């Protein structure tokens, strides 16, 4: 059964799209997806498939300013003021949007790149469906982010000017080492993956469209979640819940590996039930790469069955 | 990646929702999706996967009254007018919504049910794209569109009062048999498929509202695309290209594998090239059935790389 599911941003602008997709029979949980930055939630249709042969319901939907909601609004790659709450609370709006449906349900959240950063803010935040927690594409201590991004420029940007262009030297400095591991045969985008043809997909789906000039309130929004997903709250709060962290070697997200294995190592030694799945060689989307997505769908089936148990 | 398409319909009323899905790199074929009555095509999601991991463009619409073509006109179980000639017509119109995107490649339509008959129509029409036909749930000399269903009757609704509901009884008699090897648990749509899970679903989806009322020029128009696609005029007419059938022997709209067993022989007698997929024991959904949702899925690629070979 398909369901299509609008409702008003926080943002209080866009009609946020959605979907819900149900198997046939009696599902065992529901499984949230949360895309990342430039892309949409229908680009999942391996993975809805998956989920809903595995006898989940599958839930997601297009952010501000992405996709759909971005197609119908008009407005790309900005969410409106105080951006990453706007996401957040979104995320959260979704999970109501089933409510009395799935009520005995263990739900999964699975957030891909910023989708990881809101999955992981979602985490420390009381109301939230949390059963189990699956982070792909993850970004974690990437150099940009960490130490290049320049706070003061980007508060100065901010007091001046929220609603303008990113200016062009903080997108730099936010994303700088994405570049570090690629040839000029793979291109700009990629750090994607190591599939050429997911990459050209990538840059072709309309869909996505990625590459729109962010706002700088949006950009703001991207150093804000960061913080929320990496910050000492949230390894202080993490509920008592499976975990599992899909990722490439070769992604500069996560530091190429070393940052995911930092986030598994620091929830590990706080006693926390942590799976990690590093791709040797492969890059960002390891859920698209034709080398890892069956290992990645998989292991997630198998992860949500675990959670099921539980 | 993914395109929205929409375009008025032939009926001059509806918006036609519509899809496209293409395979990441370079696809060798385009297979067009042509969903039954009173569903959808957003409910072939798994087959979609199944054509896009075997490298093929998908393209798929809502016909008229139909699934989101019926949510957003808010129109359901009606097409306007003349309703097989529209839902033919919007079938051709989804196909030049590619035009120049993959000119060069094979097409191959599949049809299930409703669906079957429209792309039986299509296959006579010229200029159809149309490399391999592929027919599921294939509605073939049932009693009920070839004895129960009174012409006359139906004939003089249409004079009078072609835009009210259908008459109860028209309905009743176009699906007379329909029931003739369920139980009473099995329900009145238990015909849909073996598994109660698949007809549960069935009843549950919002985007295939089933049930509801069909208009009288609807049931002329499900009459129409019937003669269209089992008439003389059909099979002179069958361009000489690869046929795969697949069906259910317990399904009613083939008269439980008698009428699709007709159909193949008919075929094959004529001198064209025909695969046919009985399924013992299942009925309607063979595509849906768990039992044989997987074999029909790669019976489709294998056809689809034959018909590009
Ligand atoms: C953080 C993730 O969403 C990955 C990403 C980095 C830069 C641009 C688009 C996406
Ligand atoms: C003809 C096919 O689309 C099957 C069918 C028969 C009766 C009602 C709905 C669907």
């Not at 980007?154 to 030297?169: F, G, I, Q, R, V």
């Not at 080492?177 to 789906?205: C, I, M, N, Q, Y």
């Amino acid at each position: 059964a398909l369901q299509e599911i609008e409702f008003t941003s926080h943002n209080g602008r866009d009609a946020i799209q959605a979907w819900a997709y149900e198997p046939v029979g009696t599902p065992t949980a529901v499984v949230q997806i949360i895309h990342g930055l430039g892309e949409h939630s229908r680009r999942y249709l391996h993975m809805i498939s998956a989920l809903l042969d595995a006898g989940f319901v599958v839930i997601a939907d297009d952010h501000a300013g992405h996709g759909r909601t971005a197609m119908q609004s008009g407005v790309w790659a900005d969410a409106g003021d105080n951006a990453a709450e706007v996401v957040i609370s979104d995320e959260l709006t979704l999970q109501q949007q089933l409510a009395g449906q799935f009520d005995d349900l263990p739900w999964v959240v699975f957030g891909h790149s910023w989708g990881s950063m809101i999955a992981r803010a979602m985490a420390t935040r009381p109301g939230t469906r949390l059963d189990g927690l699956a982070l792909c594409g993850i970004v974690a201590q990437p150099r940009g982010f960490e130490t290049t991004l320049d706070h003061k420029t980007l508060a100065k940007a901010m007091a001046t000017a929220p609603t303008d262009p990113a200016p062009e030297a903080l997108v730099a400095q936010m994303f700088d080492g994405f570049a570090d591991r690629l040839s000029e045969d793979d291109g700009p985008t990629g750090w994607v993956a190591r599939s050429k043809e997911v990459v050209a997909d990538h840059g072709k789906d309309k869909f996505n469209n990625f590459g729109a000039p962010m706002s700088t309130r949006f950009l703001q929004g991207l150093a804000d979640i960061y913080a929320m997903a990496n910050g000492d709250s949230f390894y202080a709060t993490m509920p008592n819940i499976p975990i599992v962290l899909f990722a490439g070697s070769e992604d500069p997200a996560g530091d190429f590996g070393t940052g995911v294995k930092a986030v598994a190592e620091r929830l590990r030694r706080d006693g926390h039930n942590v799976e990690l799945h590093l791709y040797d060689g492969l890059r960002h989307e390891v859920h698209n790469e034709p080398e890892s997505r069956a290992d990645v769908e998989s292991s997630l089936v198998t992860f949500v069955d675990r959670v099921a148990n539980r």
